[PDB]
Amino acid sequence: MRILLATDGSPQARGAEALAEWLAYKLSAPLTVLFVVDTRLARIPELLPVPVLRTELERALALRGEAVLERVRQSALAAGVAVEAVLEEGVPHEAILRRARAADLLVLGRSGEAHGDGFGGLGSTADRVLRASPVPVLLAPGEPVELEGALLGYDASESAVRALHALAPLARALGLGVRVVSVHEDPARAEAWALEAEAYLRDHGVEASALVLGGDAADHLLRLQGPGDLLALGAPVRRLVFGSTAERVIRNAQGPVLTAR
Amino acid sequence: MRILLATDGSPQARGAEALAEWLAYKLSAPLTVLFVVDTRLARIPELPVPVLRTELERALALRGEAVLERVRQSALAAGVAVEAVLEEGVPHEAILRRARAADLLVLGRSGEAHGDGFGGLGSTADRVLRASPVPVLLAPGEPVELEGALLGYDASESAVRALHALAPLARALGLGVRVVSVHEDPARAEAWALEAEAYLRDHGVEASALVLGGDAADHLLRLQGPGDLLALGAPVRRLVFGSTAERVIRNAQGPVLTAR
Numbered sequence: 001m002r003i004l005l006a007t008d009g010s011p012q013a014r015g016a017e018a019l020a021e022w023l024a025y026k027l028s029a030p031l032t033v034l035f036v037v038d039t040r041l042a043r044i045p046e047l048l049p050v051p052v053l054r055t056e057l058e059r060a061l062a063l064r065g066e067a068v069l070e071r072v073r074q075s076a077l078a079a080g081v082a083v084e085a086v087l088e089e090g091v092p093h094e095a096i097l098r099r100a101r102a103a104d105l106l107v108l109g110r111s112g113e114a115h116g117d118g119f120g121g122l123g124s125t126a127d128r129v130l131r132a133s134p135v136p137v138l139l140a141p142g143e144p145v146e147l148e149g150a151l152l153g154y155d156a157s158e159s160a161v162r163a164l165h166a167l168a169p170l171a172r173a174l175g176l177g178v179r180v181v182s183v184h185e186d187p188a189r190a191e192a193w194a195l196e197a198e199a200y201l202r203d204h205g206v207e208a209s210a211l212v213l214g215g216d217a218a219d220h221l222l223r224l225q226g227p228g229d230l231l232a233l234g235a236p237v238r239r240l241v242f243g244s245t246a247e248r249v250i251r252n253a254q255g256p257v258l259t260a261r
Numbered sequence: 262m263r264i265l266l267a268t269d270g271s272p273q274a275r276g277a278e279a280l281a282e283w284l285a286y287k288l289s290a291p292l293t294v295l296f297v298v299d300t301r302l303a304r305i306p307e308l309p310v311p312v313l314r315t316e317l318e319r320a321l322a323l324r325g326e327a328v329l330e331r332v333r334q335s336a337l338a339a340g341v342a343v344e345a346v347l348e349e350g351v352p353h354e355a356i357l358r359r360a361r362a363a364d365l366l367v368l369g370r371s372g373e374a375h376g377d378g379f380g381g382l383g384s385t386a387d388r389v390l391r392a393s394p395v396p397v398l399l400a401p402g403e404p405v406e407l408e409g410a411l412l413g414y415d416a417s418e419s420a421v422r423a424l425h426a427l428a429p430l431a432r433a434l435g436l437g438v439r440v441v442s443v444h445e446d447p448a449r450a451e452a453w454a455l456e457a458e459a460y461l462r463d464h465g466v467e468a469s470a471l472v473l474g475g476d477a478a479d480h481l482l483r484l485q486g487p488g489d490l491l492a493l494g495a496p497v498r499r500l501v502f503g504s505t506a507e508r509v510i511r512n513a514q515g516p517v518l519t520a521r
């Protein structure tokens with residue numbers, strides 16, 4: 001099981017770096033650390049000796065990238081993790097998505113270099129990656145935190161099924177029980193969803209419990225997540241004005257989130 | 262890994278039944294066998310009527326019970342942990358619902374409606390592979406052990422899913438994988454091939470590559486032996502002349518593993 005950590009070396013990415021290393025160690029899984037030299041920054045001179053200016057900027061960005069990679073590589077080696085570092089140039093989300101094809105789990109921070117420590121939202125690189133990634137994406141808040149619990153938003157939709165299947169191995173390897181949350185006005189429908197997810201988890205060596213609720217799903221999922229709880233759910237598709245369930249959950253999440261498509 | 266075998270008890274489903282049991286045994290994986298009482302058949306009388314429908318459902322349900330008992334007996338004999346499930350509704354619908362709790366589906370290419378000379382795909386198999394959330398393995402009627410594996414890889418999203426789905430299977434079976442990447446640009450195809458080979462090796466699977474040009478479907482079809490598991494992404498659109506996967510799946514000579 002290959003873990004791919006994407007980091008821009010920013011404070012907001014520190015939690016992701018720590019979590020990826022912690023997971024690699026706990027799961028005895030190899031870790032690939034990726035830093036992308038942002039062409040959107042290097043191209044600024046062009047949007048305005050432009051080739052020279054662009055080269056000078058790329059050189060600075062690449063050197064910063066090498067420093068970040070070396071720092072994480074050093075940390076990972078110290079932890080006893082089999083780590084490899086990759087430095088590429090391009091649009092961050094595109095490069096990350098390309099490298100994701102060879103990974104089994106991605107770990108990114110909620111935000112990065114562009115936002116201060118007061119930002120509770122999601123950066124655009126993280127947003128674009130989770131919406132198009134072929135493999136599960138784990139978004140970690142800036143402040144490092146261990147995964148001490150797990151909950152799953154399950155409505156039996158295709159993506160919820162993928163989230164369910166993606167979560168099982170992680171919960172199993174970490175010894176975490178999973179709280180299945182199924183929300184619907186029809187209690188019989190929600191119950192059927194919950195029992196299904198619980199059966200799957202138990203069949204895969206994971207303890208599970210369920211909460212069959214009515215009302216607003218996003219609100220319930222957000223309120224039930226503790227700072228160390230991994231909240232797993234299907235990734236959003238449409239970009240709704242008021243936001244779909246997953247959009248509202250991911251934007252306001254207090255703890256680590258695992259998305260799957 | 263939970264394997265879900267869907268069978269209608271027909272001769273065309275015998276291959277899938279055998280393969281599912283064989284895989285469960287080889288991987289020490291639990292097996293669920295599902296038979297669906299087809300409401301499309303039971304409801305024919307609706308075209309009193311309720312009594313006639315009930316009499317047909319009763320017959321269909323009893324056949325299903327017999328099929329499940331036969332398969333369960335075989336599996337239990339091999340030491341496989343098997344669960345039997347009797348459902349009623351539209352086959353592909355019930356199969357797709359049950360798939361949400363499985364990690365791999367095993368179905369025959371065709372079933373009860375076609376003779377032993379049909380090399381095509383039945384509508385239940387078609388609908389299931391196109392909408393399944395988990396990998397679907399389509400097995401020919403004649404039972405055959407998987408003795409090899411090939412992967413059609415063009416780095417597309419579904420090809421990536423197929424690649425990730427195949428790895429655990431090839432590993433457990435000790436089969437090497439021949440990666441086939443096709444494109445007019447040799448460099449692009451090689452990059453694709455190398456990417457898949459690297460993933461497979463990183464997951465304990467030996468791999469080789471065939472970088473080709475020309476028609477992808479033709480190459481994939483021609484390279485598949487009767488015992489080779491051909492893994493590829495499931496089709497999306499229903500093209501008039503058929504997309505690559507549509508053509509491969511329709512004419513495949515051996516077992517196919519689809520993912521999406």
Ligand SMILES: Nc1ncnc2c1ncn2[C@@H]1O[C@H](COP(=O)(O)OP(=O)(O)OP(=O)(O)O)[C@@H](O)[C@H]1O
Pocket residue numbers: 006007008012013016034035036037038092107108109110111112113114115122123124125126127
């Ligand atoms: N250049 C990069 N290289 C590698 N990973 C990156 C890069 N940029 C962002 N990431 C990953 O995406 C996560 C979110 O960063 P993101 O760029 O989306 O937020 P932001 O930088 O604060 O706002 P924005 O980039 O939209 O202006 C980071 O914590 C990191 O894991």
Ligand SMILES: Nc1ncnc2c1ncn2[C@@H]1O[C@H](COP(=O)(O)OP(=O)(O)OP(=O)(O)O)[C@@H](O)[C@H]1O
Pocket residue numbers: 152153154155157158159160161163181182183184217232233234235236237238239240244245246247
């Ligand atoms: N009622 C619910 N109960 C529990 N979890 C839910 C519920 N609704 C949504 N979710 C979670 O959120 C994920 C995505 O739901 P969401 O409706 O936001 O995406 P979508 O429906 O697939 O795309 P779209 O917003 O375009 O319809 C689901 O896969 C599931 O994990």
Ligand SMILES: Nc1ncnc2c1ncn2[C@@H]1O[C@H](COP(=O)(O)OP(=O)(O)OP(=O)(O)O)[C@@H](O)[C@H]1O
Pocket residue numbers: 267268269273274277295296297298299352367368369370371372373374375382383384385386387
């Ligand atoms: N009633 C059923 N219950 C369980 N599995 C089924 C059922 N019907 C079909 N299947 C699965 O689907 C595979 C393909 O059968 P399919 O129904 O698609 O071909 P067919 O019956 O010959 O043609 P058609 O059903 O379109 O008239 C079967 O081998 C079996 O694995």
Ligand SMILES: Nc1ncnc2c1ncn2[C@@H]1O[C@H](COP(=O)(O)OP(=O)(O)OP(=O)(O)O)[C@@H](O)[C@H]1O
Pocket residue numbers: 412413414415417418419420421423441442443444477492493494495496497498499500504505506507
């Ligand atoms: N050039 C190729 N080389 C190797 N394998 C291929 C190639 N093209 C397609 N495939 C295989 O066939 C699968 C599906 O390809 P296909 O083009 O038929 O589906 P699609 O492109 O995703 O949907 P659509 O036909 O609507 O565009 C891929 O995931 C891949 O495994």
Ligand SMILES: [Mg+2]
Pocket residue numbers: 008112113114123125
């Ligand atoms: Mg950024």
Ligand SMILES: [Mg+2]
Pocket residue numbers: 157244
């Ligand atoms: Mg929805």
Ligand SMILES: [Mg+2]
Pocket residue numbers: 269372373374383385
């Ligand atoms: Mg049929």
Ligand SMILES: [Mg+2]
Pocket residue numbers: 417504
């Ligand atoms: Mg295609």
